[PDB]
C-alpha cells in the first residue's frame, strides 16, 4: 500500500528514539535556527507596562536520528509528532502570560527533511514586559523588547 510504507518509515524513525536527549548530546552543540513572523502587533497597555504580540515562531535544527530514505523528500507530518521527539524548550525571558493557541488543534506544524533538518513552527500570543520612561509623556517613545532563549540548555 502507498501509506503503509510511510507508516513503516515513521515506526523505524521512532524505534530506539529517546525524546529526553537532545541531538548530539555530549558530542556536539545543537544550532537552532529561528525566526519570527509577527501577524499582528497587539495593543500596548501603559497601565501594566505591557504589550501583546501574535507570532508564528519558527525553529529549525538538525537531528541525525531522524534521517530517512523514502519516496518523498520532506514529510509534512502531523503536529501530534511534535510530542514524540525532542524539541527546543524555548521560553520568553520577559513574557508574562503567553498563550499557545490550540483551536481547533494545537497550532503547530512539523516537517522532517530527508537529511534530518527538522522545521517546527508554532502560533503564539506573547504578552511581555515593556518598561517605560514616562518623563516625556505623551511625547515619549519606547523600545519594547521581545527576548527568547532556551530554559534548560546552556551555551
Amino acid at each position, epitope marked *: 500500500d502507498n501509506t503503509t510504507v510511510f507508516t513503516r518509515i515513521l515506526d523505524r524513525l521512532l524505534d530506539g528514539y529517546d525524546n529526553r536527549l537532545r541531538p548530539g548530546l555530549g558530542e556536539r552543540v545543537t544550532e537552532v535556527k529561528t525566526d519570527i513572523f509577527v501577524t499582528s502587533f497587539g495593543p500596548v497597555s501603559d497601565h501594566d507596562m505591557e504589550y501583546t504580540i501574535d507570532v508564528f515562531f519558527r525553529q529549525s535544527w538538525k537531528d541525525e536520528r531522524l534521517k530517512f530514505k523514502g519516496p518523498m523528500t520532506v514529510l509534512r507530518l502531523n503536529n501530534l509528532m511534535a510530542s514524540k521527539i525532542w524539541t527546543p524548550d524555548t521560553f520568553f*525571558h*520577559n513574557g508574562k502570560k503567553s498563550v499557545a493557541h490550540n483551536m481547533t488543534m494545537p497550532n503547530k506544524l512539523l516537517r522532517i527533511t530527508e537529511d534530518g533538518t527538522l522545521l517546527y513552527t508554532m502560533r503564539l500570543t506573547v504578552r511581555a514586559e515593556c*518598561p517605560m*520612561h514616562l518623563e516625556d509623556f505623551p511625547m515619549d*517613545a*519606547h*523600545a519594547c*523588547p521581545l*527576548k527568547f532563549g532556551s530554559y534548560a540548555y546552556t551555551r
Partner: nanobody
Amino acid sequence: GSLRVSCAASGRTFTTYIMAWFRQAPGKEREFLAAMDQGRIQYYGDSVRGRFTISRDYAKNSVDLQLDGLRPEDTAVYYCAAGAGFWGLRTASSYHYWGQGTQVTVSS
C-alpha cells in the same frame, strides 16, 4: 595585559536603563563595545567579542568593563554611556548620558 574600568552614576538611578561602553580612537568614529540591560543581559561588539566582559552593579549603580588580551591598536579614549535604546542599543545617538572619557594606551 589586563585592565578594569568602572563607571559610576550619580544624580539619577539607571537600574531601568541600558548601560554601554564606546571607543574613540584618534581619527575614527565612535565604536560600540558592550552593553548591559536591566535583565542582566549582555551584548558585545564583534571586534571585541570574547575578550571584554561587561558587568553591572545595581546596588551602587555602576557598570564595569574588564579588558583582557589587549593589542596595541586598541589604544583609544573609552566613553561610558547610559540610556534607553531607541533606534539603537548599538548607535551612540540613542544615549543621552555620556562620561568625560578615560584614555587607554598600550605600549609594545
